[PDB]
């Protein structure tokens, strides 16, 4: 059972200190490996498109998910970013600047796309939203 | 019509019972729902959930629908009925009749000051069904009902206005959540408070007052 002594404050406080490391969220935020990730603790990052690849969807689905492999400017890492909309892959060209964000779920893959946790949100300084909705052109 | 089959039903048909409190005082089992529908004029019912349950058989899976119906005038009587049937409408009808049969009193109290009409539960009360435990704590007047949709509906039909609720367990199991809330309400009258310390002056039970008629 729990220690209950009046003079037990050290035991309780040190015990909580030790046991908090068993919690995945605490350990994820207090261990430092987020600075080793592609974005290095950033919401967005700019990159240069290296190639367009295209990835299959997992078993219950069947489709080709069209993604662009990007190189991050700040650190030179290489990632794959989904291009969200119908026909927006044709806006992407080779060696153009692109603004990438997370997919949601904070670094964990979304939906049926295997091993992709990044999404393309801007190309050539112009939104994919404005290009898909014809508000602006590049 | 009715043609009741119980002594209580007969006494109610002859009209020698006006409220439900002379049946509550004597802990009598109410077996016919019409006894309620005369003694409680404005009783309101509501379906809270329809749930399909299935049993596996060699031919396939046989489906049945279970209905949860809370009833109550918002002036201190609530009942809860659950009924399983092959068709939603008859499950609902059976749930209404069971909910009326289950009507129980709920005592109301004051948080701090005994001004006006009673608004909260008298004191801290808890209820359990399965893994779900529901706690109800007195609240200051005008503070609303701090509860999830299911216990909020149950408490609204009870006429309680202000209460702080907390819960634990698998509340997503609506069956146990609603029955835990009902069980919490039904035991507001089972706590021994100093205003209940006065010795009881017993009264003749309805089977014994109306002996000559029966």
């Amino acid at each position: 059972g729990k220690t209950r002594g009046m003079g037990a404050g050290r035991k309780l406080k040190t015990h909580r200190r030790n046991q908090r490391w068993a919690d995945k969220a605490y350990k994820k935020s207090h261990l430092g490996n987020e600075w080793k990730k592609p974005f290095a603790g950033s919401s967005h990052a700019k990159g240069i498109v290296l190639e367009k690849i295209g990835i299959e969807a997992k078993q219950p689905n069947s489709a080709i998910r069209k993604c662009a492999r990007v190189q991050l400017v700040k650190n030179g890492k290489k990632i794959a970013a989904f291009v969200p909309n119908d026909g927006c892959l044709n806006f992407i060209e080779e060696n153009d600047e692109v603004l990438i964000a997370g997919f949601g779920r904070k670094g964990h893959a979304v939906g049926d796309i295997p091993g992709v946790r990044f999404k393309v949100v801007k190309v050539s300084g112009v939104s994919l939203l404005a290009l898909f909705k014809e508000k602006k052109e590049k | 019509k009715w043609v009741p089959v119980t002594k209580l039903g007969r006494l109610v048909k002859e009209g020698r019972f006006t409220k439900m409190e002379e049946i509550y005082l004597h802990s009598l089992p109410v077996k016919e729902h019409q006894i309620v529908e005369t003694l409680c004029p404005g009783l309101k019912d509501e379906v809270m959930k329809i749930t399909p349950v299935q049993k596996q058989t060699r031919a396939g899976q046989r489906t049945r629908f279970k209905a949860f119906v809370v009833v109550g005038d918002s002036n201190g009587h609530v009942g809860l009925g659950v009924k399983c049937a092959k068709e939603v409408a008859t499950a609902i009808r059976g749930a209404i009749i069971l909910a009326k049969l289950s009507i129980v009193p709920v005592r109301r109290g004051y948080w701090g000051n005994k001004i006006g009409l009673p608004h909260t539960v008298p004191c801290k009360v808890t209820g359990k069904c399965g893994s779900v435990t529901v706690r109800m704590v007195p609240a200051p007047r005008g503070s609303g009902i701090v509860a999830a949709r299911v216990p909020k509906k149950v408490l609204q039909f009870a006429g309680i206005d202000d209460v702080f609720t907390s819960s634990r367990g698998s509340t997503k199991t609506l069956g146990n959540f609603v029955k835990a809330t009902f069980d919490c309400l039904m035991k507001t009258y089972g706590f021994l408070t100093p205003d209940f310390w006065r010795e009881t002056t017993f009264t003749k039970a309805p089977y014994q007052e109306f002996t000559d008629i029966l």
């Binding site: - | 802990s27 129980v104 009409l117 009881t200």
Partner: protein, 76 residues
């Protein structure tokens, strides 16, 4: 119990078990109420009785018999 302006706001003050002082709730169907008659003289019965209430707790322990035995031994 009582509103602060004198009024009585509870409805149906419940009975209390005559052995344990527990409340006999509305849905406690194992409780009973006994009326034992008063024998006085010639005839040895008129409509005079003393009443005792026993809740389902006592009746289910079995201690209803002992409790009733001891509660009937009160002299008047």
């Amino acid at each position: 119990m009582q509103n602060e302006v004198g009024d009585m706001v509870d409805l149906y003050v419940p009975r209390k078990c005559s052995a344990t002082n527990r409340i006999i709730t509305a849905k406690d169907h194992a409780s009973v109420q006994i009326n034992i008659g008063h024998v006085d003289e010639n005839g040895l019965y008129d409509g005079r009785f003393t009443t005792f209430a026993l809740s389902g707790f006592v009746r289910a322990q079995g201690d209803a018999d002992g409790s009733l035995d001891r509660l009937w031994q009160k002299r008047k």
